[PDB]
Symmetry: D3
Subunit: 230 residues, 6 copies
């Protein structure tokens, strides 16, 4: 019922997992959901809804960047009355102690975007992950006993960042990893009194380049279980 979604209210579960890659979503739909049904494929976005441990859960792509994820997340909350959105995906390690394949759970996300300043009267909005979702994720990691780091992430507008010193600065402040959507996502969830969260598997390290599926599967378990808890 939207310019980017053909699904009707009800086609989506209250809990939706999203990742940038629409093909990764199709994969997750096939691989982890039982009886998954494609509910929306506008712009080949790959929107499915199935079940996990009997619970209804949807998975869909969100593209790259805060602008993209902002369209989808706002529609899902606003139109499809989705209650929870967990962002699963990859990212770039920033902190030196964070290594490739390490799983990271965002508490918050910084950004070089202007979106939040535009929504927050040009002030500093703390793009924070829903504490419930952060707890469910961390609990799920604990229960599964899957090591994972928890802290700040960075949603960059520039994948190829001209400001080469930013990386180092972030390291000094111990930002865990960098991606391109969380910062835009979190505030939207707030606006709708809904919940948002993010957990990514470090695909590489930006401050020095250093089996990769096991990490993805582990991140996916942590996410799926946390969804049940939510």
């Amino acid at each position: 019922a939207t310019p980017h979604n053909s699904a009707q209210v009800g086609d989506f579960a209250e809990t939706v997992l999203m990742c940038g890659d629409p093909l990764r979503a199709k994969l997750i739909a096939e691989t982890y959901l039982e009886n998954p049904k494609l509910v929306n494929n506008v712009r080949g976005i790959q929107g499915y809804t199935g079940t996990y441990k009997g619970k209804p859960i949807s998975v869909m792509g969100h593209g790259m960047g805060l602008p993209s994820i902002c369209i989808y997340a706002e529609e899902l909350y606003s139109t499809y009355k989705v209650k929870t959105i967990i962002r699963v995906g990859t990212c770039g390690a920033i902190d030196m102690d964070i290594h490739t394949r390490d799983i990271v759970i965002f508490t918050s996300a910084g950004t070089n975007s202007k979106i939040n300043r535009i929504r927050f009267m040009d002030h500093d909005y703390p793009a924070t992950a829903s504490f419930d979702v952060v707890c469910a994720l961390v609990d799920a990691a604990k229960e599964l006993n899957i090591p994972a780091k928890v802290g700040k992430g960075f949603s960059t507008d520039l994948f190829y960042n001209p400001q080469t010193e930013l990386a180092q600065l972030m390291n000094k402040f111990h930002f865990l990893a960098v991606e391109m959507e969380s910062a835009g996502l979190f505030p939207i969830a707030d606006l709708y009194g809904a919940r948002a969260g993010c957990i990514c598997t470090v695909s590489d390290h930006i401050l020095h380049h250093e089996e990769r599926q096991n990490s993805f599967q582990n991140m996916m378990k942590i996410a799926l279980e946390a969804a049940i808890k939510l």
Copy 2:
């Protein structure tokens, strides 16, 4: 050879047409190119290369938003040595005299993004379309005798814009239409001494909602011919 493209240098034509929808690109690939070959489908992006009037031309999706298109455009220029990128797609009419289905050729694009300020020492960068591409497009429209408006466009970071007064302001300054990529695209082309341009078919009017394929096909002709001229 990139994190978002599997194609090797050479798989892409010097002139590439891009649109947000990866399915629209597949459609254009099938519909308008002869012997199209999928050169890249990372993130289901839908990258093809074929020929038109015997000339090599590629078509690929670029997602939504300056962050997304910025990744692709930079890689195509930088890695695949693409010389020209024409953005074809839809947009929202802003000016009152601009109506749905009207075809628009961007001279430049404004934005509420921070990307260009980040690349231009926090100054006003005039995200301008390559004059060659603007000429080729306008000439193609003239030759084909297909009416089309030429002027400013707006690349919004917020599809659903909280600043409801912006629309009206843009109308006062006669911005033709609003989309989500041009502003990011144009400066990247400049940086690489390459060429960029945009031509969109107004899918709707934001200041008041007011066969749609004929307009698309007309926009597509104007673009394809302009590519030959380029």
Copy 3:
């Protein structure tokens, strides 16, 4: 050994509780610590160190505003090798569902300050509370079974804010309460690979004015116990 502290390295415990009022700190020192010794009273700041359940703990005032708390927090981390700083105090309720006397635990803090933009290359820094401290506080509340809300806070530079619409905006985004130090505190902790956190008792509601000690004592228990856990 500083321009604002006479105490020598060692006079402060690894865990320090701070509040704006230097008299409140003296009160907490007397009331909750055993054998408290005034370690610093430069600018009548009221710095004490004593014990709680046998563990060493310091309490000191931090003044009002990010500039003030930024001087103290940086010195404590940098010079006195303090590992944890929990901010205890009052605040103004913003969210409609938050009421006077309700205890609030900050996950993060937004701000209309420029400090963080100055430290973060003019980007959005997510002033986030240390997850360990947020957990210890929430666990302590759970163990003590003392209801408390957890979410975003706002560190205003303007106690008397000229931008009368901000309050309402924050309510729309569900900011829990507003104070004047957290936002400055959190990033400094990050810079020093240390920990920071905040828990305040809502002294009033800014969107409509609506025994007060019981709430303070409850907040104080939650804080003291969380400190032991840390």
Copy 4:
């Protein structure tokens, strides 16, 4: 009928050529217009109106800087119902391939001014030259067969720019030349649904100092003829 103009509605032609130097305008008035009549000399601005190939055309000085040209341009459009303003003058080459005496036709103009952000809700306004005026100028150059470069210009607020790195940055993005008025001019034309344009003769190169009248006369021909076409 204004604080900066004594001329009454009608004293100015629909097409007005302006340059910073009021003496250059007097020169152009004498040299290129037939039967020129001084219509305004408030602040010795040097406003004339005469004819060229029988068509009415005015020439006047506009001072230096966006603030100055903004006063004049707004009055001419608003009060004297001027339809077209072509800015003729000098500038500093920025691009390495651009040399002294080269004639440049602006497509758009960037700036380190705050004026446009003030008129555009603190967003990036693409100070673009009217496509009609850009075409008329380029056509006139083509018809006259006078080589001229077409691209971005920069309207600096600081002739003596403290940010010594800006120049180099602009070169990387291939800005053609730098002046001090276009950026302010273009948006005003838009606001009045009128037309603006600029064509300057490079008086020097800022990135390395490298008969000068022939270039001026050529630029002047291109401008005068383009005016007839407009």
Copy 5:
């Protein structure tokens, strides 16, 4: 010896009076200086040097806007080793208690320009008038017993200001009058360890429109005498 001045080092007095209008400067040169000699008329700027009470003093136009006055002032300080520049001219009353024809002596000048933020690491630079010049002016007014108000002025980049609420805001903060050069002037004087100052005669009131030469002559006396004192 500059792009905007033909005079050689020595042609200008250590103390220079400047006003926007080049014709007003010629008038002041003729009217108030003995044996005035035109030292520079590039861009018809009208630069003279003569004597007053036997002391050498120059008068020259500076155009409109911070960009214009910034070129001249920097050259005069830098190249012509001018020690003092007093800005004389007109302005618009802002404060309700300030009336047309009232003479105003600026202590400082605010602005909506970006120039000073560009010179001051994007911080708030207090564009302040040299205390010596402010004293000399106020003393001269006192000695001459010519009533004059002393306080903040505003250097606008937009003579025709789109932000119609600014005026009222300035009134609330009691800004005395608005012009277009001081704010740019003052910081340049600082940079050169030189002196700058401003004294204007209110030509009109912006918050409500309410012999005019007597006021000008009085302002001129105050300025000339203050120059002798300097």
Copy 6:
């Protein structure tokens, strides 16, 4: 009658001297005022009112930073109808010619705060000291024949400033000293049609570290006498 003051309207003199240190205020109260009575000690702020040469005068602490002093100053003007506030204290020398123990009288104060931009529609507000207070202070210094420098000061939000180049920049523009309150103070005085001023004794030099009471006492005399004059 405020959240930070228990004194009732009348407990404060029309002229109030404030310094960061609440203990310094108590000292000044004891040392320089006759029959001083503590009127407010909320947050141990140390508010006294006594007499000097028979005239009523109050002294109180204001904490550190613009946020802190902004709360107090606004309440004193607004609630306690205070007419004049003179800020006395310490500061850091910036200018090379300014030495430790030198007394400085602020004409204005720059800042890296965002407070004034928040009160001034994101424009440059010239945080200027009341000319009456600047005169009274300078006259008092002259009468007492106590050397003192007069010029720009800087109110930093970051005592420990990350932007290590700022210091040098300020030196180039000849900023006299740096503190943390003036910039916030001055504009508030304006808003209330009241008067504010500042005079500090340089406790150290930031660009190179170089009996200290004599300087303080001298600064205190200058202030007390200026208060009588006011």
